Design a protein around this ligand. Sequence first.
Ligand SMILES: Cc1cc2nc3c(=O)[nH]c(=O)nc-3n(C[C@H](O)[C@H](O)[C@H](O)COP(=O)(O)OP(=O)(O)OC[C@H]3O[C@@H](n4cnc5c(N)ncnc54)[C@H](O)[C@@H]3O)c2cc1C
Ligand SMILES: Cc1cc2nc3c(=O)[nH]c(=O)nc-3n(C[C@H](O)[C@H](O)[C@H](O)COP(=O)(O)OP(=O)(O)OC[C@H]3O[C@@H](n4cnc5c(N)ncnc54)[C@H](O)[C@@H]3O)c2cc1C
Ligand SMILES: O=C(c1ccco1)N1CCN(C(=O)C2CC2)CC1
Ligand SMILES: O=C(c1ccco1)N1CCN(C(=O)C2CC2)CC1
Ligand SMILES: [Br-]
Ligand SMILES: [Mg+2]
Ligand SMILES: [Mg+2]
Lengths: 483, 486
Amino acid sequence: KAFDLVVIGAGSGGLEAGWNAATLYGKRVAVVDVQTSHGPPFYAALGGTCVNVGCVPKKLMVTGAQYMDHLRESAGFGWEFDGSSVKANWKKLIAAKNEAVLDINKSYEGMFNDTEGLDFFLGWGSLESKNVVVVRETADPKSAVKERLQADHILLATGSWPQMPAIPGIEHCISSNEAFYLPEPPRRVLTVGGGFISVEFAGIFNAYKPPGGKVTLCYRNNLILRGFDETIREEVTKQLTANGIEIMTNENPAKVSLNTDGSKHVTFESGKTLDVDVVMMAIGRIPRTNDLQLGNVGVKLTPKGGVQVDEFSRTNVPNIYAIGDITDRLMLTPVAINEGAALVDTVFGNKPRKTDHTRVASAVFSIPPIGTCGLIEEVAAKEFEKVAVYMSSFTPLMHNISGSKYKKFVAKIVTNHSDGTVLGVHLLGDGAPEIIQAVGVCLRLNAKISDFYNTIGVHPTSAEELCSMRTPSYYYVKGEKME
Amino acid sequence: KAFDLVVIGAGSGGLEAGWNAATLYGKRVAVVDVQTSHGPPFYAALGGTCVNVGCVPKKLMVTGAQYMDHLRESAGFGWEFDGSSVKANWKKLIAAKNEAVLDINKSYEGMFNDTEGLDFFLGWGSLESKNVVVVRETADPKSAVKERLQADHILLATGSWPQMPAIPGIEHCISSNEAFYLPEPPRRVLTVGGGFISVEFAGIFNAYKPPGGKVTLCYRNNLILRGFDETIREEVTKQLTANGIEIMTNENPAKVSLNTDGSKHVTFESGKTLDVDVVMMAIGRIPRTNDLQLGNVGVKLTPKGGVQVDEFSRTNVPNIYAIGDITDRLMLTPVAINEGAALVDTVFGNKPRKTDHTRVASAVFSIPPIGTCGLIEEVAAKEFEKVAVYMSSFTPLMHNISGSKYKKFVAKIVTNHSDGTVLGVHLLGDGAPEIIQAVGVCLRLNAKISDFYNTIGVHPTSAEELCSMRTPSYYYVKGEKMEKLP
Ligand SMILES: Cc1cc2nc3c(=O)[nH]c(=O)nc-3n(C[C@H](O)[C@H](O)[C@H](O)COP(=O)(O)OP(=O)(O)OC[C@H]3O[C@@H](n4cnc5c(N)ncnc54)[C@H](O)[C@@H]3O)c2cc1C
Ligand SMILES: Cc1cc2nc3c(=O)[nH]c(=O)nc-3n(C[C@H](O)[C@H](O)[C@H](O)COP(=O)(O)OP(=O)(O)OC[C@H]3O[C@@H](n4cnc5c(N)ncnc54)[C@H](O)[C@@H]3O)c2cc1C
Ligand SMILES: O=C(c1ccco1)N1CCN(C(=O)C2CC2)CC1
Ligand SMILES: O=C(c1ccco1)N1CCN(C(=O)C2CC2)CC1
Ligand SMILES: [Br-]
Ligand SMILES: [Mg+2]
Ligand SMILES: [Mg+2]
């Protein structure tokens, strides 16, 4: 069959590209994915990683985990109930999550059924030739051919996949993929990694753990959440610890064996040991290029295995493009979506556009959460002669009364002190992911600190802290910090 | 007895002006208030209305009230407990609120001690003359002088006070002042009015009512929350009703009598009756100008009764300024604070600056809450030839799981369709007040609809809806509503 565009991967970026090309530019579009609905064996499916085993279900589960705090915090506001009757029923959470995910799967199925010139093919997509995509039964390229798709244009949008370290007992560990399908909440769990997935799942498991349970997070480096504002890294470490999570920094698993009762015996490089029910590896995500047989067409990969692209998502092969996590840049759903829309506008609309990967607002659904947009001060200080940091950090009042006195809200604005231009805004505390969205719009408009502090506050909010900072807390001058 | 600046009212505007004048410009500042800490008899105190009987305690109490929803909603996420054991201990809430407000009162006492020039005087400020404030023992002008303050500049910042309709049995009724100190949560309460205070308190009382409880909100006109986006007014009405609050619109109390059991018998203008334990009147706040004795220096008041001011907070009398609720405009703490900061940066910084009264972000801590900045479409439609309205309204997925299907999140962007300039943004749903703050910054920067839709979403959030709207839902062309442009 013949298509203007063939999309391999029916995910965040692939569906944006395919839908736009079919509906906005009237192109005949084929989209390929390995599964029509979530979960084992391939986990990701129609809708992509975010829908099936990412942002969507993880946010529902963090929302679930937040009730542990709400139930405890309610007491400060005079709420009374039988604390000994309280159970976190993980089975109910997982069933609720599964129904929500399946409903989305179903709605994408309906979207393909109801959208003429947008066709779905089930199976494993690979490149046979520069204008032919082959859809096969399995990831094995010797598996049976289901389809051969003639393509003027080919989009690679297969996303990423959890990295598993080649250690003894790796087979006894899981990734986020399996975590979404644990039938029972682990009493003891080790999350391995200092990134958002490890931190977010540490919070989820901490809330649903059965009585006498314990969540441990291990990270090789000294301070979790590399890439984030350093004050927020330190504070979120403290606030996790305060909620009963054991943060093991400068620690990494050397191997895992089965205790006789089937639990996991963890040996760390430091010669520390930990017995847990689950070991969840969240150490990295790698681009999914192995199965694409890109050697059939000579698409250039990086040593990492990401598809190399120009700013317009073009590979070295004309008519073959790559967007989203497969490009191993910013692994966010809205970025994949933006890159897909920009590609289709460029290629099919002759409306040349490239995605801006700077000043992208993002969040960590830790408890409490992070919202951020733009540069951290250490990065800014290397690119700008004079950098100012505006910082406000305080336990909000609701949290004196709630009894969570540890829950400091951090609000930090990083500027180019030469002209006041805001380079970065970093938030820690309830609401942070919701606050930071419109800050993204501010940074697109080259907002200055004066634009923030001359805006009238909404009171009482945590967000109004952003509009209440007149005076720098400290500076970097030619890379050097000064009070 | 000699000051660069004397401030009457140690509230939102008065303290900002006071503390700025002293710390930024090393000026010598007197601040007068009637009370050092919250509650009866004068309710407002050091810190002002917001701190003592306003934004701060209200927000703690709405937060408390939110746990009624969280406890129920937890079940959808697998939380299990004995629902029959749940009690809302109002007395605990009020004790906690009182301790939190007192600590802020003590905070401001600290501030006034730990700061040179900045000195607090207790008692009732009034104007003797152009350059003298007299502090007396009471609000009666005949009462004893405690101090006579010499004033190069005078700031009136006395705020507002609840209006109580002059109906038979008004003495059986309370205002928000007394609501903060009720010794028991009412089983049955009538909140009178359709503004933010009535709506917020209906939410609070609804969460803390004892078993067999009922919250009734009445409003004299057809639809609550005049001045808010119409879609949001209708939606808040539905979402309050869904959570058990009875909304009586086109209804207004004509009188109240005490029943023999101490309950209140409300007769409406319509002839309807209702028995409640509390009648809380929230029909308006009026500027506090009586007690200042403004007749003595001829400070001009408005046809409404607020101190008349120019864009620089200047009265008709040189050296005499007025900020915040006494000016009877937008009665918000951050506006008072902004006006104070501008007045001082102007007069003592020699850096004139005028508060911008447009594009002010504000919130209603309704359950669920409102966040809004700038013009509602009906107002835009009278000023601009072509207005576009972008609307997204859906129950967020988490509330399909929670069981609160009625919690529709509403996001509306109102534009000047001629250039795409955002004129207003109207949000209803969890997080709306937090979402809207940086939208205020966007509007200051003359953000267009394309600045929103070209910004990359934060996923998953409610806020990202504001970055997902490319196509108008409908328009106003020369005031006329229509689905499509001509
Ligand atoms: C646990 C977790 C949480 C996350 N949380 C967030 C968050 O909150 N917010 C956020 O913005 N981002 C989040 N992300 C990242 C986000 O999921 C990804 O950035 C996004 O899904 C990438 O989109 P994409 O189009 O590159 O690919 P994907 O959405 O991953 O889609 C790729 C698709 O290709 C399919 N596929 C792969 N190989 C083949 C093949 N050969 N043939 C056919 N189909 C194939 C897969 O089945 C998959 O459906 C999260 C990720 C994870 C793992
Ligand atoms: C129930 C309620 C809820 C509110 N919620 C919010 C909210 O969430 N957000 C928001 O932004 N705004 C809110 N407001 C409004 C906010 O409280 C006011 O806008 C703000 O306090 C006005 O500041 P101001 O400086 O004009 O005066 P105030 O802060 O009212 O300070 C005036 C002070 O003057 C003193 N005073 C009066 N007369 C004299 C005199 N003659 N001599 C000496 N002292 C005197 C009083 O004791 C008082 O302390 C709320 C108001 C109420 C009543
Ligand atoms: O790991 C994440 C992440 C995951 C989810 C949300 O954020 N990031 C992105 C934001 N980062 C940046 O440094 C910004 C570009 C400047 C690095 C850390
Ligand atoms: O009553 C309130 C209010 C009280 C607390 C928060 O908002 N408002 C603000 C919004 N309004 C406006 O008209 C905006 C200026 C345009 C009028 C209604
Ligand atoms: Br580190
Ligand atoms: Mg179709
Ligand atoms: Mg002092």
